Design a binder for this molecule. Structure first.
Ligand SMILES: CCNC(=O)c1c(C)sc2nc(Cc3cccc(C(F)(F)F)c3F)cc(=O)n12
Ligand SMILES: N[C@@H](CCC(=O)O)C(=O)O
Ligand SMILES: [Ca+2]
Lengths: 282, 277
């Protein structure tokens, strides 16, 4: 009987934190430094994160910048919803099967497994051909994460432009960064190295930089800078390249698209988005 | 139905208007007409052939080529960017609302109330509200108590904006005391405001982030600066305004996203917006 919107998200701190529920099935009552209670949602998702493995779905606790944004959107527009984490753990690329298919949250939204994507989902040309993106809720770019001590000028450093098996670098598989390094002819050499080392998740990659398994991680500045400020053993290097925004994703025939963008614009104008930025990102 | 009526407005470096060759539009310029009145006792006037260039004009050239349309570019004469008066829109927004233009190209800020009456493209220039001061002036930003509670200071801080645009609308909505206080310091335009900042008649000038960053970058002697590292309150962007339900939006959005991906936007930023300071 449920007419609730199905929301798909992904584990991606500081936008989406994913934690286990307590034994009673509720979310641990936590507070910000501002003394305000952290709003939390029950989000179902697979427990076994491993690829090509059976997915056992369990209720979990979701919170962060994107959850606070969802709550405001649902409040403003008066919609009911239920949250789940993308079964395959990916953002979403279109891959060759003659036929082509979308994976990640893109695939879930297009199949009908989701009615809206509320995550740090990059707005790019490839996705915009198939889905409606709201006006951006955040404008950021790409940067590089390294272990402290490593010296790199940025993307144009000889250790990246002239690859070798000595210095290993990567990004997340089936993500907008993966799309970008594959589309741009000028990044072909860089992509050929990366396609061999690319990680299943940003968290797996950040941990491998810490464990000296990966030397450089190319990812979203909004995520990398947050990680660098929290883990002082990791530092962001170089200047920002490929600037892009994050947007809410919907199917092209969604009746909510105009009011989702209007709500995002209202939130930028009244300081709500800056409040979220202060609570979670800076 | 490929030949489109397009409205623009002069605002350097986004749209720069020049006189025609004393016979046509040479170089990187495109023709733009401006309706000029014979006098103020009549509605009679004439179209004056001018030449247009700039960051937004280069975007229009790329879109025209990629999306495959031709156009008749004109400069708005009824207001500027867009203001709602008793539910009646003027400026570039008004021209689109009242279907005298298919699209508005320029330094046009995306905001919620304009989005209720027009469709905006994806943003293609990052902007919002910034504060220009003479180097050394101590203000944290738009939320500093000098702005929020001006009369707590002796003498009070003197600050203003150019009224009737998205900056004034935002301040009116968010900071009612600040807005009613600022109105005595309303500036006719950006050139008058900068001169008031230099002649010591103004302490701060609040305006569109993209235009202030450009003006700070070219300021003679680099005396005038934007607070913070060019901090932006009410972050937004410039977008192309199209009529609600426009068949042109899909392709324009796809073309603008394609331009960013290919580094073609970064080139325009290098060519038109960067400066000495
Ligand atoms: C064609 C894709 N556009 C871009 O990659 C892009 C620029 C190239 S400049 C710019 N500026 C913002 C700033 C911004 C931040 C938050 C919210 C908004 C808004 F809601 F107005 F759209 C913004 F425009 C967002 C943004 O995507 N771009
Ligand atoms: N870009 C603004 C004009 C300048 C401003 O008010 O800051 C607008 O579209 O209204
Ligand atoms: Ca779109």
């Amino acid at each position: 009987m449920s007419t609730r919107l199905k929301i798909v998200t992904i584990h991606q701190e500081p936008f989406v934190y994913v934690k286990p529920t307590l034994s009673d099935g509720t979310c641990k009552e936590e507070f910000t430094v501002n003394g305000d209670p952290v709003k939390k949602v029950i989000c179902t998702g697979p427990n076994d994160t491993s690829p090509g493995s059976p997915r056992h779905t369990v209720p979990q606790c979701c919170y962060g910048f994107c959850i606070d944004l969802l709550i405001k959107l649902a409040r403003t527009m008066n919609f009911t919803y239920e949250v789940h984490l993308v079964a395959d753990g990916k953002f979403g690329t279109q891959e060759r099967v003659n036929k082509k298919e979308w994976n990640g949250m893109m695939g879930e939204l297009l199949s009908g497994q989701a009615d809206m994507i509320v995550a740090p989902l990059t707005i790019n040309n490839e996705r915009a051909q198939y889905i409606e993106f709201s006006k951006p809720f955040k404008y950021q770019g790409l940067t590089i994460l390294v272990k402290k001590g490593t010296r790199i000028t940025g993307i144009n450093d000889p250790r990246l432009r002239n690859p070798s098996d000595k210095f290993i670098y990567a990004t997340v598989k089936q993500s907008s960064v993966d799309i970008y390094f594959r589309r741009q002819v000028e990044l072909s050499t860089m992509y050929r190295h990366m396609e061999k080392h690319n990680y299943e998740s940003a968290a797996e990659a950040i941990q491998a930089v810490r464990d000296n398994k990966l030397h450089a991680f190319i990812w979203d500045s909004a995520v990398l800078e947050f990680e660098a400020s929290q883990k002082c053993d990791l530092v962001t290097t170089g200047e920002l390249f490929f600037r892009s925004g994050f947007g809410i994703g919907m199917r092209k025939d969604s009746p909510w698209k105009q009011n989702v963008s209007l709500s995002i614009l209202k939130s930028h104008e009244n300081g709500f988005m800056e409040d979220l930025d202060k609570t979670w990102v800076r | 139905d490929n030949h489109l009526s397009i409205v623009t407005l002069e605002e350097a470096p986004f749209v720069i208007v020049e006189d025609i060759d004393p016979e046509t539009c040479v170089r990187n310029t495109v023709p733009c007409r401006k309706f000029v009145k014979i006098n103020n006792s009549t509605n009679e006037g004439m179209n004056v052939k001018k030449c247009c260039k700039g960051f937004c004009i280069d975007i229009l050239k790329k879109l025209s080529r990629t999306v495959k349309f031709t156009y008749d570019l004109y400069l708005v004469t009824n207001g500027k960017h867009g203001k709602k008066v008793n539910n009646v829109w003027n400026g570039m927004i008004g021209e689109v609302v009242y279907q005298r233009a298919v699209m508005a190209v320029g330094s046009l800020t995306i905001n919620e109330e304009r989005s209720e009456v027009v469709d905006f493209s994806v943003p293609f220039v990052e902007t919002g509200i910034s504060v220009m001061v003479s180097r050394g002036t101590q203000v944290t930003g738009l939320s500093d108590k000098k702005f929020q509670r001006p009369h707590d200071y002796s003498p009070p801080f003197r600050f203003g904006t150019v009224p009737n645009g998205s900056t004034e609308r935002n301040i009116r909505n968010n900071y009612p005391y600040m807005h009613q206080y600022m109105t005595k310091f309303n500036q006719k335009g950006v050139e008058d405001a900068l001169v008031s900042l230099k002649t010591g008649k103004l302490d701060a000038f609040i305006y569109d982030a993209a235009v202030l960053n450009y003006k700070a970058g070219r300021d003679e002697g680099c005396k005038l600066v934007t607070i913070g590292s060019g901090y932006i309150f009410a972050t937004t962007g410039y977008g192309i305004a199209l009529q609600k339900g426009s068949p042109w939006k899909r392709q324009i959005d796809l073309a603008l996203l394609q331009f960013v991906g290919d580094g073609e936007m970064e080139e325009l930023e290098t060519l038109w917006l960067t400066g000495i300071c």
